[PDB]
Enzyme design. Structure first.
Site, PDB file in Angstrom:
ATOM      1  N   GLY A  45       0.862  -1.420  -0.020  1.00 60.60           N
ATOM      2  CA  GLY A  45       0.380   0.400   0.321  1.00 60.60           C
ATOM      3  C   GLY A  45       0.750   0.956  -0.166  1.00 60.60           C
ATOM      4  CE1 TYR A  49      -0.372  11.902   6.470  1.00 60.33           C
ATOM      5  CE2 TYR A  49       1.985  13.232   7.483  1.00 60.33           C
ATOM      6  CZ  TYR A  49       0.178  12.938   7.045  1.00 60.33           C
ATOM      7  OH  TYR A  49      -0.510  14.156   7.446  1.00 60.33           O
ATOM      8  CE  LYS A  67       4.487   3.621   9.666  1.00 63.42           C
ATOM      9  NZ  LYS A  67       3.003   3.860   9.854  1.00 63.42           N
ATOM     10  CG  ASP A 155      -5.157   8.406  12.067  1.00 65.16           C
ATOM     11  OD1 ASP A 155      -6.633   8.918  10.838  1.00 65.16           O
ATOM     12  OD2 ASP A 155      -4.606   7.784  10.351  1.00 65.16           O
TER      13      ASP A 155
HETATM   14  O1  LIG Z   1       1.065   1.977  10.091  1.00 66.63           O
HETATM   15  C1  LIG Z   1       1.168   1.421  10.685  1.00 66.63           C
HETATM   16  O2  LIG Z   1       1.343   1.024  11.744  1.00 66.63           O
HETATM   17  C2  LIG Z   1       1.571   0.028   9.900  1.00 66.63           C
HETATM   18  C3  LIG Z   1       1.767  -1.340  10.543  1.00 66.63           C
HETATM   19  C4  LIG Z   1       1.743  -2.275   9.256  1.00 66.63           C
HETATM   20  C5  LIG Z   1       0.992  -2.200   8.295  1.00 66.63           C
HETATM   21  C6  LIG Z   1       0.043  -0.914   8.156  1.00 66.63           C
HETATM   22  N1  LIG Z   1       0.052  -0.914   6.194  1.00 66.63           N
HETATM   23  C7  LIG Z   1      -0.643  -2.169   5.410  1.00 66.63           C
HETATM   24  N2  LIG Z   1      -1.113  -3.308   5.747  1.00 66.63           N
HETATM   25  C8  LIG Z   1      -0.837  -3.813   4.929  1.00 66.63           C
HETATM   26  C9  LIG Z   1      -1.544  -5.668   4.328  1.00 66.63           C
HETATM   27  C10 LIG Z   1      -2.278  -6.177   3.437  1.00 66.63           C
HETATM   28  C11 LIG Z   1      -2.003  -7.554   3.531  1.00 66.63           C
HETATM   29  C12 LIG Z   1      -0.581  -8.414   4.545  1.00 66.63           C
HETATM   30  C13 LIG Z   1      -0.326  -7.474   5.555  1.00 66.63           C
HETATM   31  N3  LIG Z   1      -0.115  -5.858   5.686  1.00 66.63           N
HETATM   32  C14 LIG Z   1      -1.606  -3.331   3.423  1.00 66.63           C
HETATM   33  S1  LIG Z   1      -1.281  -1.408   4.351  1.00 66.63           S
HETATM   34  C15 LIG Z   1       0.732  -0.094   7.989  1.00 66.63           C
END
Ligand SMILES: O=C(O)c1cccc(Nc2nc(-c3ccccn3)cs2)c1
Length: 331
Positions: A45, A49, A67, A155
């Site tokens: 994704g 930010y 990230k 958030d």
């Molecule tokens: O900012 C954060 O603390 C944070 C921590 C973990 C993940 C994400 N963001 C995303 N994770 C996914 C995803 C999709 C399928 C399997 C695993 N992850 C898509 S977007 C953000």
């Protein structure tokens, strides 16, 4: 005179009783791992930010999530890192595993536990009444924990609640907007997504607290039980308060403004109007009635209050009848 001050009803002084280093994140020194431990697999994704990737830790063959942060003030990075480290191991809080300095971007990359996600736009349309109570209870565990640790998320919204539905696991993610609660501190009101902003943010009342997260949670609950996403669908920050007022009524809004002596932006004069407080039944129909019950409506009503001081705490919410069967099953 100016606005009347406010303090959190619960967990008011928890940071005051900590050593300064717990909450003084500007003076946090980041502990860096080795960026060569991680090979990116694919992109998951991207947002304003950060960009988020699947990765492999090649030292132990573990899947992780990385990230990679886009440029932001170092104090905001220290804030998110310090909050993640403070909350690590708490119930349903995403686990920060490592921090590395990305060679290309020269920005930090946060390394998180892997968690499988079912996208909410596909999950929320298959959730049962029980599932919603269950996952709301799991979110409440994370919010009570972080609030008890002196931290408001600021958030809370569907994108930041990752749900592995197959294993009935949930994690509250993206702590980049989170902040430490200190009594008397005035906070930035330009936080949260539009549809989830509390009334205190929309009227520019800066001395807010953990109860902001409880408004956002009520917005999520309304969208899930009524199958209406987003529930308060404003065109901008001004119209957002209008959409709330057409449901909660303007009488309690003006009472709220009066109670805290809030100076209302004159733009609101011509647009708020006069509105009765609506009954929740008007959002019930044949496609959502199986998710709506007297218990759900009583619980929802006690979250969505203008006066942040009168909203349920996370711990009070967990004791509501809406969760009696979830609580009984977890024993
Ligand atoms: O900012 C954060 O603390 C944070 C921590 C973990 C993940 C994400 N963001 C995303 N994770 C996914 C995803 C999709 C399928 C399997 C695993 N992850 C898509 S977007 C953000």
């Amino acid at each position: 005179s100016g606005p009347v001050p406010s303090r959190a009803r619960v967990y008011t002084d928890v940071n005051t009783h900590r050593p300064r280093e717990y909450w003084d994140y500007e003076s946090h020194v980041v502990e860096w791992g080795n960026q060569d431990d991680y090979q990116l697999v694919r992109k998951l994704g991207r947002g304003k930010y950060s960009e988020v990737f699947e990765a492999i830790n090649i030292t132990n063959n573990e899947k992780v999530v990385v990230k990679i942060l886009k440029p932001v003030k170092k104090k905001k990075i220290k804030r998110e890192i310090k909050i993640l480290e403070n909350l690590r191991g708490g119930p349903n809080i995403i686990t920060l595993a490592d921090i590395v300095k990305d060679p290309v971007s020269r920005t930090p990359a946060l390394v998180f536990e892997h968690v499988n996600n079912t996208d909410f736009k596909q999950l929320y349309q298959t959730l049962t009444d029980y599932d919603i109570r269950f996952y709301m209870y799991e979110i409440l565990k994370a919010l009570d924990y972080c609030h008890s640790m002196g931290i408001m998320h600021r958030d809370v919204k569907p994108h930041n609640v990752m749900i592995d539905h197959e294993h009935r696991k949930l994690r509250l993610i993206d702590w980049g907007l989170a902040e430490f609660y200190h009594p008397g501190q005035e906070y930035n009101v330009r936080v949260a997504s539009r549809y989830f902003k509390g009334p205190e943010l929309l009227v520019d009342y800066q001395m807010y607290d953990y109860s902001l997260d409880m408004w956002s949670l009520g917005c999520m609950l309304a969208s899930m039980i009524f199958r209406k996403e987003p529930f308060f669908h404003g065109h901008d920050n001004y119209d957002q308060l209008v959409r709330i007022a057409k449901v909660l009524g303007t009488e309690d809004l003006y009472d709220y403004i009066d109670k805290y002596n809030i100076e209302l932006d004159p733009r609101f004069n011509d647009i708020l109007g006069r509105h009765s407080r609506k009954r929740w039944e008007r959002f019930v129909h044949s496609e959502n009635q199986h998710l709506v019950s007297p218990e759900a409506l009583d619980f929802l009503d006690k979250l969505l209050r203008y006066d942040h001081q009168s909203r349920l705490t996370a711990r009070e919410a967990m004791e509501h009848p809406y969760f009696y069967t979830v609580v009984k099953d977890q024993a």
